[PDB]
Structure 1
Amino acid sequence: SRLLLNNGAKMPILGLGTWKSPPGQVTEAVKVAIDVGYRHIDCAHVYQNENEVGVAIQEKLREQVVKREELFIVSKLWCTYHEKGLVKGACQKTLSDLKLDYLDLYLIHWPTGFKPGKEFFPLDESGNVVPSDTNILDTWAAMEELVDEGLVKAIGISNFNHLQVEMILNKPGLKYKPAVNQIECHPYLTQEKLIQYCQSKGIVVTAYSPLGSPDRPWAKPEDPSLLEDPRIKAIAAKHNKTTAQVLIRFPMQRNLVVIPKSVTPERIAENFKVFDFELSSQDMTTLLSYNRNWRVCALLSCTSHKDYPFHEEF
């Protein structure tokens, strides 16, 4: 139900994701998620919907449905805010949109820093992404002060490869270890090496895009579908569960936190009904064998960036 983080806090193993959740739909989605029993919401400034997520959280708090301590609210620092003097400001903007006074967890969204500005993906005249000369260790030191100032309870990373995680763990004067590395993970990208690395260092892994992100804006029709994989449908039929429920239970039995996105109330409810069954070790080993090393999120505009995470093996 909950995993212990290295700061002592308990992170709920199931959360609601909010990337691509339209502002006009996400307030309803979050309110239903909280009624249904979700206690963990994954957010980000770059999703352009934190205000509307925050309206739902405020409504449920005022209603007494949950108290603030029961909720685990995550957001992420966007790439254009990596320099030291910008980090606190980005966090405070997210805090006011969400209408909270602290975050439970704040992640560096990607290891790549972009030129600061109003564009989330700043382009030059030849059309490619303009990098910041900032690095990971300096951004980490700026994240560490947010903990010292009470704005966030825990800090972590996202889309970091093992050498990048290593860089942080080996930083002279390291005060707070990354609590969480949030990475893409599903049966087509099982991440066995990066997961075994992080867990050995006491870092909790959160699996994003657990259903394969079928609503990703760069989807093609010849791309594989997890939800339609007949081999995964078969494992689900055996358990009297849906394929989505199998795909959500899968990371859970690997001791991963999982954050499926939905704005549809019956799917939000369906995705919650995953605690009352178990995949056998045979089901688990079978699902692991489906690995293709296929990424939904490869950040393909930044493949030349000095900190691009996905050139390394893991």
Structure 2
Amino acid sequence: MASRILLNNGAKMPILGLGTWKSPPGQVTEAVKVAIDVGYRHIDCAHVYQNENEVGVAIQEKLREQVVKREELFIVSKLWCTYHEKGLVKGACQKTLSDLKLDYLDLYLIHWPTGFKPGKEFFPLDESGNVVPSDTNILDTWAAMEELVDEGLVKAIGISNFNHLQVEMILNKPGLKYKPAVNQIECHPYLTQEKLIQYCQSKGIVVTAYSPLGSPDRPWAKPEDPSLLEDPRIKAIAAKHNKTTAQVLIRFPMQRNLVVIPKSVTPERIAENFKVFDFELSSQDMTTLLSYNRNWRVCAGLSCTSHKDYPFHEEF
């Protein structure tokens, strides 16, 4: 298992990264420092996570300490939905760059296909509770992302939470200048995503799997929800390989040619989650894990279901 995958912009992306959604601002600086110290070279970020300044403190300290060189890091962030407007994309990217202490991003993603009314609120609401859309169509947002490549702010651009038809809309854009490099989507044994992964891979788009552990810290978790880390069938595969359940859950997407971004702020787990390059799941293990699909989402985007570009009405 090579550590990096080749993107359609000609750059290499580490297949294992550290997630940062929900990482508390008072813990994420140490988490990222530990991650870099134990071998991580890819950090997944977003403005909407409200912790990029603190992530950036860690990156900058490790660059200053010469633990790593900038060219060895692969830093990803995402354009939030209230910035889909032509005239707001550059400033949103620059705010992320200034918070992360960087002069470029390796990859910048459209976080969701849904644009919202700009303003201070990340989910602007009408008086009845629906998100207020923007009329900017996503093809125009894509053109604004392409500009960022041409201005040197980002090395690669991509998408996140785009369904099959929305990916196709990007690929069929009149005058398309840069194809998406990545589609970052939820993916794990309970949401295996065969249809969408095959489509993206067939077009040369690399897929990143988010919430690979089933996001046990998601704010809306309920006791009755399925739990990947506690599933005895997955624990049994882990025991057979002398690995933890989390290690199996991370290795699984790697063997599907996916990038994977488990989140932790616990130093021991950050280290555990990196120790996934020294064992192999059999084809039978892989097919068995795929069989657990039930189309279950951590991230259903429930605050934007009324938006015309909501991605999860479609089968895939």
Unpaired segments of 5 or more residues in structure 1?
Answer: none
- Per-residue CA deviation, residues 24-59 of structure 1 (Å, 9 max, x unaligned), is 000000000000000000000000000000000000
- Per-residue CA deviation, residues 155-206 of structure 1 (Å, 9 max, x unaligned), is 0000000100100101111000000000000000000000000000000000
Unpaired segments of 5 or more residues in structure 2?
Answer: none
Whole-angstrom distance in 1 between the partners of 2:129 and 2:175: 39
Whole-angstrom distance in 1 between the partners of 2:127 and 2:278: 55
Of 293, 296, 308, which residue of structure 1 is paired with 2:295? 293
Is the Cα–Cα contact under 8 Å of residues 131 and 306 in structure 2 kept in the other structure? no
Q: Secondary structure in 2 aligned to 1:106?
A: strand
Whole-angstrom distance in 1 between the partners of 2:41 and 2:28: 15
Q: Secondary structure in 2 aligned to 1:308?
A: coil
- Per-residue CA deviation, residues 220-255 of structure 1 (Å, 9 max, x unaligned), is 000000000000000000000000000000000000
Structure 1 runs, 4 residues or longer, greater than 6 Å off:
none
- Per-residue CA deviation, residues 246-265 of structure 1 (Å, 9 max, x unaligned), is 00000000000000000000
Q: Secondary structure in 2 aligned to 1:84?
A: coil
Q: Secondary structure in 1 aligned to 2:33?
A: helix
Q: How much has 1:126 moved relative to structure 2? A: 1.4
Q: How much has 1:121 moved relative to structure 2? A: 0.6
% same residue:
99
Tell me the TM-score normalised to structure 1 length. Answer: 1.00
Q: How much has 1:125 moved relative to structure 2? A: 1.3
Whole-angstrom distance in 1 between the partners of 2:247 and 2:129: 41
Q: Give the aligned partner of residue 123 of structure 1.
A: 125
How many residue pairs get aligned? The number is 314
Tell me the TM-score normalised to structure 2 length. Answer: 0.99
- Per-residue CA deviation, residues 39-91 of structure 1 (Å, 9 max, x unaligned), is 00000000000000000000000001100000000000000000100000000
Deviates more, 1:296-305 or 1:217-226: 296-305
Is the Cα–Cα contact under 8 Å of residues 130 and 306 in structure 2 kept in the other structure? no
Whole-angstrom distance in 2 between the partners of 1:46 and 1:302: 15
User: What's the C-alpha RMSD, in Å, of the aligned pairs?
Assistant: 0.4
Whole-angstrom distance in 1 between the partners of 2:67 and 2:304: 43
Q: How much has 1:304 moved relative to structure 2? A: 1.6
